Amino acid sequence: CPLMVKVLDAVRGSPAINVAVHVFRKAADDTWEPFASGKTSESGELHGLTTEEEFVEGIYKVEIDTKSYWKALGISPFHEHAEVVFTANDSGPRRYTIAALLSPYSYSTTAVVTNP
Amino acid sequence: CPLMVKVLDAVRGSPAINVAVHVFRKAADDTWEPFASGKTSESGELHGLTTEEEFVEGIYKVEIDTKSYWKALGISPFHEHAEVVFTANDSGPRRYTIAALLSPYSYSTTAVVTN
Amino acid sequence: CPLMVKVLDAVRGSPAINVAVHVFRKAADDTWEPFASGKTSESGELHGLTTEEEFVEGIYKVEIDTKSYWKALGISPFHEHAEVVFTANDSGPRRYTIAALLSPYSYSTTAVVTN
Amino acid sequence: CPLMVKVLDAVRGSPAINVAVHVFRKAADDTWEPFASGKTSESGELHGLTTEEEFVEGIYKVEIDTKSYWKALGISPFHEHAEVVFTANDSGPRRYTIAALLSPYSYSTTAVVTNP
């Protein structure tokens, strides 16, 4: 599994469950093409977005739909979403975990990049 | 000053100086329109981006060119840029400070909305 | 002002106001000696903790009473307090800003060391 | 496993390996008694610190030895260590993960608390 997302909720001290995530890849014409999407599980994790074969070199945007997550919990958050934009596989195949920590007016995102 | 940006460097423990920042507003057709830009000062701050007259309710994107910042320090970063997308509202508090803390493989962003 | 503290609230997007802060210096016997204290202002800041004459090289602990802050907002927090421990050095930059971002089950702290 | 530590390195985008961790518990006389210690593994994780039986109600301090970690990588960091202080098991047994993200002049710590 070459592309990982893991989301935590800094208000509840829990995984952030059912968080929608949309992945895009920059096309040759410089537009964002839809690449993959999904929702975090009970554990706050999202696996199986892509395969090594399909996950080629490129610039990727991981959109984490934070506003919808917070709204459902009765909180009016600041951000529309978190977007994490990065070049992937530009030195051969890697495994990426995008880790996000969510508060209503703040978020952090960290990448864990490993060589399999 | 309705909209300020402050950027800090978590590796050097300093303001992040000369970081390019580009602000966009979402247009009716859902495309991003350039709105304002600048570079952070020696205090890591960017002021005078817009005015209260111009800064109307709407969706905005603040783009922070973190990749160029790290490259100028000889450090290989993960992100192309940091991206902060939000709705500006007239209701609640109306001075917006977008704060950002930068590491090569991590960033955090916080909004300070005051009266 | 050799040592400043700024505290932000990540739930409300505001300065963290009236947060008690206690500063300690490590004594020769490795015990913590009270050094300075105060409460954050309406801007979430604490100034005038010490002077350049008094703020000598040594190990310091800045304790931020986050638990009481959350309790006053009716929110159940994880931590007893935030704890920031560091060596003050004369060599490098010498205005220290201890910045802290608070969530109920999370906090971040950053040091801004300037010239 | 009722007490978890997981540490990441925000400079290298990797787990923080061989990070020393010391756990203390507040005694009846208000002193910090040594409770458990260990080092993060290749995955940045530390397991097996304690057992449900030994992990009773109390106030705990998790000290993460960040300064030694950074020094070995040739970086002079700001903090001596991270200390995470919390009441545990004060409403019955829980499982705790203390998650830390490290930069030379900054750190964050989040708790993930689950009911088994």
Ligand SMILES: CC1=C(CC(=O)O)c2cc(F)ccc2/C1=C\c1ccc([S@](C)=O)cc1
């Ligand atoms: C070690 C670690 C993990 C691994 C895990 O949970 O399995 C993690 C996962 C997430 F989804 C979010 C954060 C973390 C984390 C540390 C951490 C990161 C950012 C912050 S922000 C900058 O306040 C604080 C702490």
Ligand SMILES: CC1=C(CC(=O)O)c2cc(F)ccc2/C1=C\c1ccc([S@](C)=O)cc1
């Ligand atoms: C109080 C505060 C300020 C205000 C200031 O210093 O002027 C600030 C400005 C920034 F550009 C970035 C962070 C902070 C901050 C606390 C803080 C925020 C995020 C993190 S991340 C999530 O580790 C950690 C600490």
